[PDB]
Amino acid sequence: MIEENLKQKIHDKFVAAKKNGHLKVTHAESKKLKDPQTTTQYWVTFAPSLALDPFANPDEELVVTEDLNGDGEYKLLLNKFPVVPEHSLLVTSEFKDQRSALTPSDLMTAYNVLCSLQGDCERYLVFYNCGPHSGSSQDHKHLQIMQMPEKFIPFQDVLCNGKDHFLPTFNAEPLQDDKVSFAHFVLPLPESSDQVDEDLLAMCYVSLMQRALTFFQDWTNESPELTKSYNVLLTKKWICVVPRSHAKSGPPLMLNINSTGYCGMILVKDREKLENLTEDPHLVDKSLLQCGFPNTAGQKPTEYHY
């Protein structure tokens, strides 16, 4: 069960630690962009000062909760050097590898945290960077939770809008936006948290995973396995998985891309890059392709390697 008054606890732990120097906020400014070609909305954050096992012994002043549930599964830590204020890490109490899949209780715990923070009108995102190409910096398993920008509408939203929860089958594949350059898989989630339980979440994740895995494992055995990497993104309205080829993008930007990139949130460290993207928002779409695999919308996962 999720700690009571989690949101106030996060807030209060955060202001206190900013106050006395247990965390320092990196200054940043953000703005909206729109891909003229693909229509996809982006949120670009600019943090110049950035160009100039923490979970083992985390600073107690940063620990919002020792166990997010009754179980010794999870602790909730504040990010020590956040761009987004109150940005938090759900860390496995005991060590596990970040290359491991999300369990069912992982999913239910993350969804419950979202519900708790969202007041049941701010929006929260929960995400997981799995593997070397995901943008994962650390090997100790953790999820991340952060508030999404107030007016930002990620493409997943429009993708899922007015589309009821379902699960994939041979007739119905996960939603994927064809306008975007990159492979991704999304299921809408029920509007009401009463329709959401562990098993629904688990089945959502497994079926998304099976699509994501086809870029790594090959059923024809005409290729040897690759190393698995993917982003999981979870909000209250949908869940999404992105297979990842490279942690960092190619020549013009060379952005480090994590989960947030794939709902369209980009972090840039220098003003030349910031103006490149302003002039040409379509660069983001190109970067997302370099870091992922090309869009598979309208295809059976089975025919990828065949």
Side-chain angles (χ1 to χ4, degrees), residues 183-203:
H184 66 285
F185 313 90
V186 186
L187 291 163
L189 291 179
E191 131 75 14
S192 177
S193 55
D194 312 337
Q195 325 306 326
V196 177
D197 65 90
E198 190 162 313
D199 308 325
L200 173 144
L201 277 166
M203 294 303 95

Side-chain angles (χ1 to χ4, degrees), residues 11 21 26 54 90 98 101 128 134 137 159 163 172 187 200 202 213 227 292:
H11 182 76
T26 300
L90 288 68
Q98 177 84 338
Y128 191 54
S134 69
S137 35
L159 185 59
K163 259 182 200 82
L187 291 163
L200 173 144
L213 297 167
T227 295

Side-chain angles (χ1 to χ4, degrees), residues 22-81:
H22 288 96
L23 76 68
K24 199 197 275 180
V25 178
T26 300
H27 285 23
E29 298 294 333
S30 313
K31 66 171 165 180
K32 192 148 304 179
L33 292 186
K34 176 205 156 57
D35 201 315
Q37 206 111 44
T38 75
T39 72
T40 306
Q41 299 254 74
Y42 307 116
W43 188 257
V44 191
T45 297
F46 176 49
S49 86
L50 246 20
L52 315 166
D53 180 25
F55 304 130
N57 187 13
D59 175 336
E60 180 172 3
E61 287 71 41
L62 296 191
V63 167
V64 178
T65 307
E66 271 309 345
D67 46 312
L68 199 41
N69 312 317
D71 24 274
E73 295 298 288
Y74 282 99
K75 74 237 285 96
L76 193 54
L77 271 48
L78 296 173
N79 180 350
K80 195 191 215 85
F81 302 117

Side-chain angles (χ1 to χ4, degrees), residues 60-221:
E60 180 172 3
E61 287 71 41
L62 296 191
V63 167
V64 178
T65 307
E66 271 309 345
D67 46 312
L68 199 41
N69 312 317
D71 24 274
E73 295 298 288
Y74 282 99
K75 74 237 285 96
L76 193 54
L77 271 48
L78 296 173
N79 180 350
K80 195 191 215 85
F81 302 117
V83 183
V84 179
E86 300 188 14
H87 174 191
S88 286
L89 292 353
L90 288 68
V91 176
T92 53
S93 306
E94 58 175 352
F95 184 100
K96 308 173 175 190
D97 198 291
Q98 177 84 338
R99 278 186 315 262
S100 60
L102 298 187
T103 70
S105 54
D106 287 349
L107 297 161
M108 195 59 226
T109 297
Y111 183 85
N112 279 330
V113 175
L114 288 158
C115 286
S116 169
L117 303 195
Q118 275 187 204
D120 60 309
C121 223
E122 328 126 30
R123 245 193 121 159
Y124 284 80
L125 170 65
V126 161
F127 62 92
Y128 191 54
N129 307 320
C130 187
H133 312 319
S134 69
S136 173
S137 35
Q138 298 289 341
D139 70 335
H140 182 139
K141 167 164 186 187
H142 60 284
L143 288 76
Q144 316 201 24
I145 175 141
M146 70 162 57
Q147 191 172 292
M148 265 185 297
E150 300 180 10
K151 283 98 159 163
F152 187 56
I153 306 304
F155 76 95
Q156 286 99 340
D157 279 24
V158 327
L159 185 59
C160 297
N161 81 116
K163 259 182 200 82
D164 280 309
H165 162 67
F166 68 91
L167 297 113
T169 60
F170 306 114
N171 273 15
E173 196 73 6
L175 306 187
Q176 177 167 192
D177 182 349
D178 47 318
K179 305 187 293 296
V180 306
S181 60
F182 54 91
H184 66 285
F185 313 90
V186 186
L187 291 163
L189 291 179
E191 131 75 14
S192 177
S193 55
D194 312 337
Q195 325 306 326
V196 177
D197 65 90
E198 190 162 313
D199 308 325
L200 173 144
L201 277 166
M203 294 303 95
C204 275
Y205 172 71
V206 173
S207 62
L208 290 184
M209 282 306 287
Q210 302 293 330
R211 275 65 179 195
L213 297 167
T214 65
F215 299 84
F216 311 101
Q217 302 134 23
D218 172 19
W219 71 266
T220 73
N221 296 323

